[PDB]
Amino acid sequence: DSTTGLYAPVTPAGRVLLDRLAAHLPRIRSTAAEHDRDGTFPTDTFDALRKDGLMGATVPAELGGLGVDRLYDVAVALLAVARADASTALALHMQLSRGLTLGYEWRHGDERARTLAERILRGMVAGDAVVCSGIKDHHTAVTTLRPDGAGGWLLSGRKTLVSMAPVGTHFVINARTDGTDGPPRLASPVVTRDTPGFTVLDNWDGLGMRASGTVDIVFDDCPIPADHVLMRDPVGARNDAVLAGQTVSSVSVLGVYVGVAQAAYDTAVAALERRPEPPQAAALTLVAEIDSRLYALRATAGSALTAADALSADLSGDMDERGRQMMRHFQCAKLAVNRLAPEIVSDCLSLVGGASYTAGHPLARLLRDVQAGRFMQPYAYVDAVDFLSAQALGIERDNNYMSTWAK
Numbered sequence: 001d002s003t004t005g006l007y008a009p010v011t012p013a014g015r016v017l018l019d020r021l022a023a024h025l026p027r028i029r030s031t032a033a034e035h036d037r038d039g040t041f042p043t044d045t046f047d048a049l050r051k052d053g054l055m056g057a058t059v060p061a062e063l064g065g066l067g068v069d070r071l072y073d074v075a076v077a078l079l080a081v082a083r084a085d086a087s088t089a090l091a092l093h094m095q096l097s098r099g100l101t102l103g104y105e106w107r108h109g110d111e112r113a114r115t116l117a118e119r120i121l122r123g124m125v126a127g128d129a130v131v132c133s134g135i136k137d138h139h140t141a142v143t144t145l146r147p148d149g150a151g152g153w154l155l156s157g158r159k160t161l162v163s164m165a166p167v168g169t170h171f172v173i174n175a176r177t178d179g180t181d182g183p184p185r186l187a188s189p190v191v192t193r194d195t196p197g198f199t200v201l202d203n204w205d206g207l208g209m210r211a212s213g214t215v216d217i218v219f220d221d222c223p224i225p226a227d228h229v230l231m232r233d234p235v236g237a238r239n240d241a242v243l244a245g246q247t248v249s250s251v252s253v254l255g256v257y258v259g260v261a262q263a264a265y266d267t268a269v270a271a272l273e274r275r276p277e278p279p280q281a282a283a284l285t286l287v288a289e290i291d292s293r294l295y296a297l298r299a300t301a302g303s304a305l306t307a308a309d310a311l312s313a314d315l316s317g318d319m320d321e322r323g324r325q326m327m328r329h330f331q332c333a334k335l336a337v338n339r340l341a342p343e344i345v346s347d348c349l350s351l352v353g354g355a356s357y358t359a360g361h362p363l364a365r366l367l368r369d370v371q372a373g374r375f376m377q378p379y380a381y382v383d384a385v386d387f388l389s390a391q392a393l394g395i396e397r398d399n400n401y402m403s404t405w406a407k
């Protein structure tokens with residue numbers, strides 16, 4: 001019955017998601033070290049989740065999905081998976097996040113939007129759609145959509161860091177229009193794996209998250225129909241209202257780092273309890289410091305998730321304010337998660353001692369994986385500080401990171 005600290009799902013659908021996942025932990029857990037050493041994606045893990053209905057966990061119930069719709073419960077499930085393997089959890093988050101955001105498109109967007117959403121969502125439930133996300137351009141390229149002169153579009157460019165890509169059937173891509181007449185827009189084409197000119201590379205070589213499939217994808221004159229395109233707003237047109245969607249789509253990933261911290265602790269404590277001698281002064285002191293820091297990490301992520309779910313559900317008010325507040329809870333918590341979670345994992349290696357310094361020890365992988373959140377937008381630390389200090393001091397700024405990137 002816990003409602004804090006991400007200790008338990010707060011809804012019956014979240015409870016099912018977590019009980020169902022339990023069945024896959026032994027596989028996820030078992031191929032973790034091999035996939036980390038090789039830098040390869042656990043495709044058999046994802047085949048099993050697909051067949052089990054789990055890749056449709058956040059599709060509305062109305063469409064055949066489990067209907068998990070709390071970010072809190074997604075975070076709880078991701079925390080559980082990340083305790084078994086962080087890379088799998090991170091890949092799964094892209095899919096569960098999409099269930100939530102496509103859900104929103106389905107209930108609230110225009111007819112093109114609702115129709116695309118509904119078709120992808122039903123595919124997610126069926127095990128036919130595995131939806132990847134491509135936001136950041138490779139340095140060599142600016143990803144653009146140009147009119148084909150015939151109703152549809154041609155997508156050229158390259159995205160870097162596209163987790164789950166080796167198994168993705170659908171790729172939601174951040175692109176800017178060009179060669180029309182409007183000021184450039186933000187646009188989200190959806191590319192299917194068999195679109196021509198679309199290539200999935202195999203160049204993911206990570207410090208951590210080595211098994212997350214986080215490769216580049218290339219678009220070369222890719223034909224995209226007009227109705228497979230979610231049009232966004234003009235580049236640099238400031239509406240804080242977009243911040244809500246950008247909170248929905250990443251905030252629950254915080255649970256991955258909370259689970260990595262939890263797994264480091266569980267490992268350290270199991271290591272101490274397996275020892276002949278009674279723990280030393282500094283070992284007892286570390287264990288209490290980590291117990292407390294893990295509690296604060298869980299409560300800070302749990303609390304922002306709770307708040308986000310409440311702000312998310314309320315569409316009655318000022319939508320710009322809703323956006324600002326969502327992003328505020330998310331980024332205040334993220335900054336804390338990105339300091340507490342690596343520090344907890346690092347202190348656990350102090351408890352275990354030099355055994356943790358061999359490539360194969362579980363802590364050695366958790367130390368590497370736990371750093372990943374520091375590099376995920378919105379926002380990495382340097383950008384988080386510009387956003388938070390602007391909010392705190394009421395400084396007007398373009399808070400859309402993709403809008404900025406398009407500049």
Ligand SMILES: Cc1cn([C@H]2C[C@H](O)[C@@H](COP(=O)(O)OP(=O)(O)O[C@@H]3C[C@](C)(N)C(O)(O)[C@@H](C)O3)O2)c(=O)[nH]c1=O
Binds near residue numbers: 098100101104246
């Ligand atoms: C305004 C609003 C939008 N939305 C939704 C509908 C839009 O499709 C979406 C726009 O969000 P967003 O602009 O974040 O786009 P996205 O396609 O989700 O991309 C993200 C990028 C990220 C964070 N790196 C990720 O890879 O982890 C993945 C999973 O996706 O946000 C809401 O759910 N609630 C809202 O109140």
